[PDB]
């Protein structure tokens, strides 16, 4: 019971306040939350566009 109230008042309420503040006020301005660009490897496909990155140059494999 004490752990339940602790998790409600010390984790859930702060995360609610912080998520609201970030999602509706901080990101309302440009460049406030800047993400590192995700890595792209050959053979991947993009959700936004849907094209397929071509594979590599079939290097000679041995050992």
């Amino acid at each position: 019971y004490r752990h339940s109230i602790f998790a409600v008042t010390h984790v859930l309420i702060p995360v609610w306040i912080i998520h609201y503040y970030l999602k509706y006020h901080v990101t309302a301005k440009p460049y406030t939350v800047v993400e590192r660009k995700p890595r792209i490897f050959p053979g991947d496909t993009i959700l936004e566009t849907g094209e397929v990155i071509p594979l590599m140059k079939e290097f000679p494999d041995q050992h």
Partner: protein, 175 residues
């Protein structure tokens, strides 16, 4: 978001890869994001919708103030105090606007450096070049004026720079 102009603050198209699981083990990250969504994003969204509808019930506006152009210091008499006052205020407003332009370019550069990752040295050449040009122009306009800066001192600095440029051009042409 429509809260800012996308051309003033450009961004790349943000192409992201697709999940390609290779094993049958369930990754904990997806489940954690689902429970995060259910426990955090929904109540926050509901509270936001309530607050937004309350704001829609009461809609009112504020405006950007427009400023007329007035004669600058280059067309004021020596002791005509009213014209110098107006020109000084206009010059100070222009100085603030130039500072904010430099700030915008610096924000572009910082965002590029963070976004590009390990290839920032090659992929942020345009932002670096833009910042170099704007910094050079700002340094030419406003550097070394002092704490007691004014439009007259800026005009004197520009006049001396133009005199030096004219002398150098005449010397190079008459080489």
């Amino acid at each position: 978001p429509d809260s800012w102009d996308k051309d003033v603050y450009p961004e790349p198209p943000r192409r992201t890869p697709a999940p390609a699981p290779q094993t049958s083990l369930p990754n904990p990250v997806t489940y954690l994001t689902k429970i995060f969504d259910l426990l955090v994003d929904r109540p926050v969204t509901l509270a936001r919708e309530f607050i937004e509808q309350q704001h829609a019930k009461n809609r009112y506006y504020y405006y950007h103030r427009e400023f007329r152009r007035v004669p600058d210091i280059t067309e004021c008499e020596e002791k005509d105090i009213l014209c110098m006052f107006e020109a000084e205020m206009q010059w100070r407003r222009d100085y603030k606007v130039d500072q904010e332009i430099v700030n915008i370019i610096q924000e572009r550069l910082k965002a590029c450096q963070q976004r590009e990752g390990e290839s920032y040295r090659q992929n942020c050449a345009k932002e670096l070049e833009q910042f170099t040009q704007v910094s050079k122009a700002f340094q030419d306009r406003y550097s070394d004026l002092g704490a007691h800066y004014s439009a007259r001192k800026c005009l004197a600095k520009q006049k001396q720079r133009m005199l030096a440029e004219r002398k150098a051009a005449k010397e190079a042409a008459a080489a």
